[PDB]
């Protein structure tokens, strides 16, 4: 699957709302689609699905504020934050 699409798939599942696909510029936190619990769930799901570890200390609601921006952040971090054998 396309990386962006697979990320949006995970996000939609954690948010339990496909709106994150329909409008990838929706303000996730301003619209209450995700809370702190959901943020942890999301980061854990990302590591499980992609083996990309995003430390909670790196997450910023202002930077990871829309589906598009989350996809973009993960894209930037993918290489350096992937587990190493
Ligand atoms: O990290 P946040 O989402 O901003 O935390 C919000 C808090 C501070 C209000 C937090 O205590 C909280 O979410 N309480 C509700 C119970 C819960 O879900 N705790 C786990 C937070 S990841
Ligand atoms: Mg937080
Ligand atoms: Mg950090």
Curated annotation (Swiss-Prot):
Record's subcellular location: Cytoplasm
Lineage: Bacteria, Bacillati, Bacillota, Bacilli, Bacillales
Post-translation changes: 4'-phosphopantetheine is transferred from CoA to a specific serine of apo-DCP.
UniProt name for this protein: D-alanyl carrier protein
Alphabetically ordered keywords of this record: Cell wall biogenesis/degradation, Cytoplasm, Phosphopantetheine, Phosphoprotein
PTM-bearing positions, type O-(pantetheine 4'-phosphoryl)serine: 36
NCBIfam families linked: dltC, PRK05087.1
Any one Gene Ontology molecular-function term assigned to this protein's record: D-alanyl carrier activity
């Amino acid at each position: 699957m396309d990386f962006k699409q697979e990320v949006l798939d995970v996000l939609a599942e954690v948010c339990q709302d496909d709106i994150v696909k329909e409008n990838p510029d929706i303000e996730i936190f301003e619209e209450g689609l995700l809370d702190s619990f959901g943020t942890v769930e999301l980061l854990l799901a990302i590591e499980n699905r992609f083996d990309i570890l995003v430390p909670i200390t790196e997450f910023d609601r202002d930077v990871w504020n829309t589906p598009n921006n989350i996809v973009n952040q993960l894209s930037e971090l993918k290489r350096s934050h992937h587990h190493h054998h």
